[PDB]
Amino acid sequence: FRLNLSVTTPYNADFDGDEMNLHLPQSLETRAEIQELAMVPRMIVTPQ
Amino acid sequence: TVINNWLLIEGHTIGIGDSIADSKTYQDIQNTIKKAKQDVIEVIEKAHNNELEPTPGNTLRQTFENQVNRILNDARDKTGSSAQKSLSEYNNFKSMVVSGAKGSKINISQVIAVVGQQNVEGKRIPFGFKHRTLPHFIKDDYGPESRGFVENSYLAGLTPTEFFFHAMGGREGLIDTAVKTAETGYIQRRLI
């Protein structure tokens, strides 16, 4: 799995043996939900 | 993309040359260490002849420990400041610190100037043996190197006693991680 380094901070990823999980949404409704709520560019600023 | 492609031209590295002082800073660091050693020797001498005024709010041992810790911490801070002064604008540790990418002032100070005092449970190295930390010292020795002060830097290497003391200091971090993970997991689950 290859990913841009800017997103290594939210994941606290390390590139030294770290493993990550990938889930594939199976329906159009679910895919639209992911695209409209949880895409990476939409999570730049945290509410915390 | 743009910065990573310009780095092909500019380049970046780090090496032994980025950890060396100009041989005049080494004299200053050694002088500061000698001053701190003389100071703590003097305080122990005053306690030997019973002149330490007890702090109004702390025990005699507590005020003695506070005095020694203050002296040692001031010595490490002064040595660190001198080390940062010595760094050139071409140095790579300084570049990676001021950029905020990695490292901090304490890392440079420990690599160049001095590792500093080791601590377990917030205190100096306890007397595991009867009235001495290691068999190599004399009983009832509260001097700096006896109770877990490392006077060498990571470049010069640690002597065996302070190597063992630094191992003691490092073990607590792993222990604390191993307990804190499970302690905070239940907190977070209950909050959820």
């Binding site: - | 002088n31 001053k35 003389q38 100071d39 003097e42 305080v43 005053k46 005024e53 702090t55 109004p56 709010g57 005095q67 203050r70 002296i71 001031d74 002064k78």
Partner: protein, 429 residues
């Protein structure tokens, strides 16, 4: 009010001829003081000369107590320009040829010089124009060089010292200027500015000649020379500077030679040097951390300075108030309170030598305004009242009464017992 009306009209209507006539009539009536004066209109000849003369008279009617207040007021209006400053300094030099109290005028001129330097003046060349030092062009130019630079140049000092310690020494007025000695001790007794042991002896000789040498002058002509204080004073300065500037020496090493230290600090110039060295040595807030004695020997040294010499009292008081007004970090609250108690003990020791009024005035000012801890003030008053005896000066009581009128007088007597409370002073008022 109508006079100020007329002045503001003439300001607003300069071309109004009847306004000029009205100003003329106001001048005729004898109220010329109300027309713009002091610092506003000191560019006119008669007005500036009159206002400068009045301010000089005010200073001379001031005294030691008025030194801190009126002198900046006078200095800001005499140094507003190089022409006014030139007139002031020329008149100071003209009076300075007369010693019948002209030492006061010389003091005023020196204070004006140092204020001008604080502002940014290159007034050292002006001062050399004042003195007879300009009669030796080489030495005068060298002094101008060092005082525009502000540093003790070794080659320049060799050039100056060549003319001295001979049968033809330059007039002492060249070497007596306050700026020379002040910059000299700022550069020498400072822990910095390392000297490579070569021309330092020449510096010591120059300082000894400036301070400890006696020159007799009649009608501003050199009469006789006294060189009694040139070997002992020079040796004292060398030993003191060696002790002070060997900063690698520990505290115990300096304490070990306290006998010769006390012998040497019995000199005024040595007293100023050691005072300034202590000022630099304690200025770093880190110094107290490495200070492993609750009651320093530095404080006893300041006590010795205060006791032996009285003309140095304002400087010790200034140091004490500076140390008192600063909060010390990385310490204990109880440690800070103990340090304040020791500082007030030093204040009482200063009060002992007769220097009383400024200390009490500052204590009152810091108490009533910008209230500090009341325990410190009560302890200070307790120490003061137990070391003074009746009768008392009227002004001394006049300034010591308000502090004791309030701020927890009931607690001023807790556990003393054998001796009577402060009320006796009240009975003696």
């Amino acid at each position: 009010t109508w006079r100020d009306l007329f002045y503001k009209l003439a300001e607003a209507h300069p071309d109004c001829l009847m306004l000029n006539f009205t100003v003329k009539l106001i001048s005729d009536a004898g109220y010329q003081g109300e027309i713009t004066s002091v610092s506003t209109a000191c560019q006119q000849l008669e007005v500036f000369s009159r206002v400068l003369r009045t301010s000089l008279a005010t200073i001379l009617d001031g005294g030691e107590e008025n030194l801190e207040k009126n002198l900046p007021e006078f200095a800001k209006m005499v140094c507003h320009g190089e022409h006014t400053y030139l007139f002031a300094q020329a008149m100071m030099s003209v009076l300075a040829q007369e010693e019948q109290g002209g030492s006061a005028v010389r003091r005023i001129a020196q204070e004006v010089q140092r204020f001008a330097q604080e502002k940014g003046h290159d007034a050292s060349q002006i001062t050399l124009a004042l003195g007879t030092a300009a009669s030796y062009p080489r030495a005068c130019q060298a002094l101008g060089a060092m005082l525009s630079k502000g540093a003790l140049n070794p080659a320049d000092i060799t050039v100056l010292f060549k003319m001295f310690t001979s049968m033809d020494p330059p007039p002492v007025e060249l070497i007596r200027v306050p700026a020379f000695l002040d910059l000299f001790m700022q550069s020498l007794f400072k822990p910095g500015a390392r000297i490579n042991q070569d021309h330092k002896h020449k510096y010591i000789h120059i300082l000894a000649y400036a301070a400890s040498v006696v020159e007799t002058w009649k009608k501003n002509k050199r009469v006789s020379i006294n060189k009694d204080e040139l070997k002992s004073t020079s040796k004292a300065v060398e030993t003191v500077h060696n002790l002070c500037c060997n900063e690698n020496k520990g505290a115990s090493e300096l304490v070990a030679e306290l006998s010769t230290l006390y012998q040497c600090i019995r000199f005024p110039v040595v007293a100023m040097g050691v005072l300034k060295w202590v000022d630099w040595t304690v200025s770093e807030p880190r110094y107290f951390q490495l200070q492993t004695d609750h009651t320093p020997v530095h404080l006893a040294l300041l006590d010795e300075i205060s006791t032996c010499h009285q003309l140095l009292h304002p400087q010790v008081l200034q140091l004490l108030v500076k140390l008192f007004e600063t909060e010390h970090s990385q310490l204990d609250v109880m440690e800070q309170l103990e340090l304040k108690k020791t500082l007030l003990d030093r204040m009482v020791h200063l009060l002992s030598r007769g220097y009383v009024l400024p200390v009490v005035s500052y204590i009152r000012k810091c108490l009533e305004k910008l209230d500090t801890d009341i325990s410190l003030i009560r302890y200070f008053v307790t120490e003061v009242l137990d070391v003074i005896a009746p009768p008392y000066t009227s002004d001394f009581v006049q300034l010591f009464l308000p502090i004791l009128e309030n701020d927890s007088i009931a607690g001023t007597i807790k556990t003393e017992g054998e001796h009577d409370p402060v009320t006796e002073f009240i009975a003696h008022c």
